[PDB]
């Protein structure tokens, strides 16, 4: 799970580089290091944001899965095995599997929410703020601001 989270964070932080790869194509032999370092720092910040958001939303997700918990209760109990089962282990196993699926769905939702928020302000920034500043500096600052806001929306400790 840690490895897949690592890879997902890196790929979602690198896909902006994927769309910025051939769109301008300025000195790749020298801009590759800049792209790598920005991707790494964005990956770290977005991973911190993902951890914070999943931790804060797990409280709601606990009761969000209650209907599915009861649905699995129905099947785990509607059997002659449940007539002479442990009568408690069933609850433990269904809680474990529902927690696992809840964590998976919550992480997916958070990752894609941050990804969707990533490509909202960057386009308008590159379209407008280039009037007075260098386009490359504008793209760099837009990416930095997007990463910072993605990190800050997690905790929100204003």
């Amino acid at each position: 799970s840690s490895a897949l989270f690592f890879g997902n964070a890196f790929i979602v932080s690198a896909i902006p580089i994927w769309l910025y790869w051939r769109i301008w194509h300025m000195d790749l032999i020298q801009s590759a290091v800049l792209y790598s370092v920005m991707t790494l720092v964005s990956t770290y910040l977005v991973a911190f944001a993902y951890k914070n958001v999943k931790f804060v939303l797990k409280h709601k997700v606990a009761q969000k899965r209650e209907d599915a918990v009861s649905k699995e209760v129905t099947r785990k109990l509607s059997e002659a095995d449940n007539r002479k089962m442990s009568r408690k282990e069933k609850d433990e196993r269904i809680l474990w599997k529902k927690n696992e699926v809840a964590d998976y769905e919550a992480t997916t939702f958070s990752i894609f929410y941050n990804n969707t928020l990533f490509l909202v302000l960057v386009i308008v920034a590159s379209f407008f703020i280039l009037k007075n500043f260098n386009p490359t500096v504008n793209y760099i600052l837009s990416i930095s601001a997007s990463s910072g806001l993605i990190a800050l929306l997690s905790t929100g400790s204003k």
Partner: protein, 56 residues
């Protein structure tokens, strides 16, 4: 001098004639840039999801 006499274009000794055929006039979309801003409408779906989160 013939035009004032209501004479047809073809009743005067001409030099020659040419026939033109260029069907396919004007060839595109009306607005090729304003549709780019329409990508912002997809965030209304996550806004509705956030409203649902506020609700339930």
């Amino acid at each position: 001098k013939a035009q004032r006499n209501n004479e047809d274009v073809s009743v005067i000794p001409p030099l020659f004639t040419v026939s033109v055929d260029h069907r396919g006039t004007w060839n595109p979309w009306v607005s090729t840039e304003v549709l780019a801003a329409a990508i912002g409408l997809v965030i209304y779906y996550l806004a509705f999801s956030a409203k649902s989160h506020i609700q339930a």
